[PDB]
A paper describes a structure:
Cryo-electron microscopic (cryo-EM) structures of the three types of particles: F-particle (~ 64%), EC-particle (~ 3%), and EE-particle (~ 33%) were reconstructed to 3.2 Å, 3.8 Å, and 3.1 Å resolution, respectively. By contrast, the EE-particle exhibits a typical expanded form with a ~ 4.5% increase in diameter (~ 340 Å) and notable perforations at the icosahedral two-fold axes. Superimposition of the asymmetric units (protomers) verifies the similarity in capsid structures of the F- and EC-particles and reveals substantially conformational differences between F- and EE-particles in several exposed loops, such as VP1 BC, DE, EF and HI loops, VP3 EF and GH loops. Remarkably, most of these loops are key determinants for immunogenicity in HEVs, indicating that EC-particle, rather than EE-particle, has more potential as candidates for the development of a vaccine. Incorporation of EE-particles in the vaccine would require a rational strategy to facilitate the structural transition from the expanded to the compact state. Notably, VP1 C-terminus, appearing to be the most divergent in sequence among the four subgroups in HEV-Bs, is largely disordered in the native virus structures (F-, EC-, and EE-particles), indicative of a cryptic immunogenic site, akin to the VP1 GH loop in foot-and-mouth disease virus (FMDV).
Numbering used by the authors:
A (entry chain 3): 10 to 238
B (entry chain 1): 56 to 286
C (entry chain 2), D (entry chain 2): 81 to 330
E (entry chain 1): 118 to 234
Write the structure that this text describes.
């Protein structure tokens, strides 16, 4: 009509015709899709416990050494964008720019201990309509891998995409409809005389190749509204 | 298998956005509120600043649209029948004559492209190409403006897009007409390089990258604290 | 060389390339036609039961003597395989017990990991009999002892007679592996189904016993973590059943 | 497997066979014809500037937070490359930063070695600006801090915001490498020349910043040497200039 | 295919506008799960996400077309079921049959006189 849709692509007359643009040169690192920024790993703040968030201690998962053998290392609700563990990483900063999302999440746990240390962890994953495991025996009968840190230093754990519908809303909280990734002590942490007994795990989350987003909007993080000065 | 066209760089950085709302009168008094002025910078609006600051180097044309709605001021000496309001919107190309006030020769300069628009029809639109000596605009500049590390830390860079000045063309004696301009800026043919992390700290001013130390994420009860467990 | 093993859409175990022991020389297999006596078809649950059931880790301390699990009671609560032990009457299954330790290079010790078919055990009191509560727990290990046990209905849990009245060094006759912390780290034994009948009821019968006995005791200096976790992982093989009914009990 | 690298008739560096990171996917190269705007020829000093400039070693202690060098100011006094920064007007160069540590097998820790193009940094006081003396020293590192810096014209050197106001875990977006002392020992990043102009004056502009941040802190027992030396070695690549004149200053 | 027929009038009483320029109206379609205006002059109106039409009085009416917007593969006139999980909630009202809202206001800043559309 004779209206102005703000979401309407139209050519306009150039204000400065007869002007030659500077010839574009080859700059390395061209981006064509926002999903290429989400498919890189970013360090996941798993230890966000209100006295670590203002330090580097909210990136290090503590694995103490001694006699536990039945307790938990960590655990979180597997939903990027709304969970505090994931909403500030590169994947969960791009998901907050969109209202729908669909795809897999790839986790990677790196054991940052000494080469003389040896142990075993049970990395369990629970499905979306399922309760978090409460002990190591319940987590064993679910979906688990055994990460023997004497043999491998990283444990890549890819998480499947299970939903009734095609996409999934980012800003909503369907409790008990996302999945949990917990980790349990299996053996402990065995060190020789001279090695430090306690250690550190780091987690890295990214997207996969089947990832997609839809329905762009404004990020919840920026609250400022008035112009700067 | 889904489609990834919603998160391309063109579909993510090309939406029109109201970046500047000003008002300008049509009768005398101080020689400042008779016109409007906007130096074209993508730093005063935080929402668009954060999307542009996911990249180091950008290259785009501009697509600026002006939504001008006027009104009749109250008080005595009202115009009754007033013909129609015509407005001049002038784009001062970077390094071009800039109006000190209304009715200045800068307005009648041939060099500065201008649009004469009459009220009651479709809004005024103009397109500006990539205007830089360099080969891209830079959202960041780790460096200085002058030679011997003297000057402001990245503000006199060749990232100048120009100004936009708007005034009434009419010579209206009786009655005042107050117009309000809305600028809907939009980039076209965006090409972006060197992806940067999204900002955590809030902004303080549109000349810096200054910040206050903020937490990396939001707190939780324990390391093994999944939430709610409805069942 | 750090090859991952995925068995079913739940399990991941990471392991290097090492040596296996295959049974008495046979791989586990499915029952053929001229091997059974039952009047029906097996209907094996291959689509759901073949995964890794990683049990809880035991702590090999300096003064520990040995541990045993009785099978198939060791997977009584472990998931869907425990449900098939409820809602069936007969069963037949091989297993792939994988045992591995996490020690440093400054630890030393040696384990013997045996699978003993029909490891019937004597009681700690002569002229008396054992109870089922002293033979095995459902998922946790049962400890051997250095000294003499002296209970009324318990098991003679002295370590050098292995609970069976034999020499403990002669348990090398059955399928076995040595975890020597100097050179070896892991042990993996593939047990077939051994019985005198083609299918038995897997509540009353204990098919085999997995014993883990330290022959050279664990030593370490004062810097070291004062235990080595031993992690056992059982994966059933070619499990097939008969006699669909309700659970008893329960 | 211990192959030596000789670059120019002065330098020898010994290194094993490991992984490299090549830029944003491009190798450094020389400027072609349809890429420049200057009115002259480059006259690249290939015969004298391509060698290894091994900077001084920093000590990774238990309580250290991180270090950064700004480039190309990090080679301001380093030999003939520092002379070319004096006696020229424009310059264009890629680099091959090689970072390696000398730790034992009884040490533990993890580093993140980033090359951040256009790492513009905010000040420790809002409504104020930095000076050039607080952005970088000429050859020594600048330390991040655990707590909040509070100066007037300094840099906000808190470690989890990386001096740029971002999340420190998201610096993995730029070319990077992880030195994990359990498995990795060295890190080598090949940075190309990234700018919006084909050639810039390399006194005012900082092309990139090399940050080395420990994510898992260094732990050791009481026998051990209580630091790990981190040695950085920068080798320029395809350096070419324009504008021969005197040195200013001096 | 939604079409808006907007006719305005001049309100009676004192302080009348005499000559008033022209009335421009903003019609905003809030896509399902989009910012919804609490009142007039709210940032929701200036949100880029919610598609809007600026229409001037005296010409052809304003028209917009909205596609099939649902996570599901159809809308359902009936829903024999519940909204939440354990048979709790309203009997078929929070279903994915949401088409959005439509909000209309005057763009003008009219001080003297009221115009009722």
């Amino acid at each position: 009509s004779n209206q102005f849709l703000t979401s309407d692509d139209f050519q306009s007359p150039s204000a400065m015709p007869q002007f030659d643009v500077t010839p574009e040169m080859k700059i390395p690192g061209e981006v064509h899709n926002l999903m290429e920024i989400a498919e890189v790993d970013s360090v996941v703040p798993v230890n966000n416990t209100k006295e670590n968030i203002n330090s580097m201690e909210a990136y290090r998962i503590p694995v103490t050494g001694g006699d536990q053998l039945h307790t938990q290392v960590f655990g979180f609700q597997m939903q990027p964008g709304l969970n505090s563990v994931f909403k500030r990483t590169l994947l969960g900063e791009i998901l907050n720019y969109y209202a729908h999302w669909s795809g897999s999440v790839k986790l990677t746990f790196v054991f940052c201990g000494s080469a003389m240390a040896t142990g075993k962890f049970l990395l369990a994953y629970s499905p979306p309509g399922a309760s978090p495991p409460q002990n190591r025996k319940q987590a064993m009968l679910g979906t688990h891998v055994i990460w023997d840190v004497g043999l491998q230093s990283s444990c890549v754990l890819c998480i499947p995409w299970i939903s009734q519908t095609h996409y999934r809303l980012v800003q909503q909280d369907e409790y008990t409809s996302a999945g949990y990734v917990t980790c349990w002590y299996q053996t402990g942490l065995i060190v020789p005389p001279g090695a430090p007994p306690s250690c550190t795990i780091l987690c890295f989350a990214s997207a996969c190749n089947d990832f997609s987003v839809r329905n762009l909007r404004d990020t919840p993080f920026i609250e400022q509204t008035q112009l700067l000065q | 298998y889904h489609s990834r066209t919603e998160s391309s760089i063109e579909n993510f950085l090309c939406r029109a956005a109201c970046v500047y709302i000003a008002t300008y009168k049509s009768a005398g008094g101080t020689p400042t509120e008779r016109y409007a002025s906007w130096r074209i910078n993508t730093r005063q609006m935080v929402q668009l600043r954060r999307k542009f600051e996911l990249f180091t180097y950008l290259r785009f044309d501009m697509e600026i649209t002006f939504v001008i709605t006027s009104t009749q001021d109250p008080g005595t000496q009202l115009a009754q029948d007033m013909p129609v309001l015509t407005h001049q919107i002038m784009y001062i190309p970077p390094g071009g004559p800039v109006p000190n006030s209304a009715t200045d020769f800068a307005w009648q300069s041939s060099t500065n492209p201008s649009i004469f628009w009459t009220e009651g029809c479709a809004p005024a639109r103009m397109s500006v190409p990539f205007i830089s000596i360099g080969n891209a605009y830079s959202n960041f500049y780790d460096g200085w403006s002058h030679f011997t590390q003297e000057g402001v830390y990245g503000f006199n860079s060749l990232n100048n897009m120009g100004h936009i000045y708007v005034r009434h063309v009419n010579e209206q004696s009786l009655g005042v007409s107050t117009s309000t301009l809305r600028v809907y800026f939009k980039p076209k043919h965006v090409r972006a390089w060197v992806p940067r992390p999204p900002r955590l700290s809030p902004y303080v001013k549109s000349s810096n990258v200054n910040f206050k130390p903020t937490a990396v994420t939001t707190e939780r009860k324990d390391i093994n604290d999944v939430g709610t467990l409805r069942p | 060389r750090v090859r991952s093993i995925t068995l079913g859409n739940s399990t991941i175990t990471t392991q290097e390339c090492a040596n296996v022991v295959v049974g008495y020389g046979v791989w586990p297999s499915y029952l053929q036609d001229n091997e059974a006596t039952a009047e029906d078809q097996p209907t094996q649950p291959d689509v759901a039961t073949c995964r890794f059931y990683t049990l809880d880790s035991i702590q090999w301390q300096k003064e520990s003597d040995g541990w045993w699990w009785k099978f198939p009671e060791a997977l009584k609560n472990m998931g869907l395989f425990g449900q098939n032990m409820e809602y069936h009457y007969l069963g037949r299954s091989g297993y792939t017990i994988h045992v591995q330790c996490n020690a440093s290079k400054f630890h030393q010790g040696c384990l013997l990991v045996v699978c003993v078919p029909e490891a019937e055990m004597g009681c700690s009191d002569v002229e008396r009999e054992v109870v089922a509560a002293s033979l095995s727990s459902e998922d946790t290990a049962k400890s051997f002892s250095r000294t003499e046990s002296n209970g009324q209905h318990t098991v003679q849990t002295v370590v050098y007679n292995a609970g069976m009245g034999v020499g403990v060094g002669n348990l090398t006759i059955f399928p076995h592996q040595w975890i020597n912390l100097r050179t070896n780290n892991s042990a993996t034994i593939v047990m077939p189904y051994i019985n005198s009948v083609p299918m038995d009821n897997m509540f009353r019968h204990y098919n085999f016993t997995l014993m883990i006995i330290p022959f050279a005791k664990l030593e370490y200096t004062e810097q070291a973590s004062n235990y080595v976790p031993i992690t056992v992982t059982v994966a059933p093989m070619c499990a097939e059943y008969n006699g669909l009914r309700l659970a008893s009990h329960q």
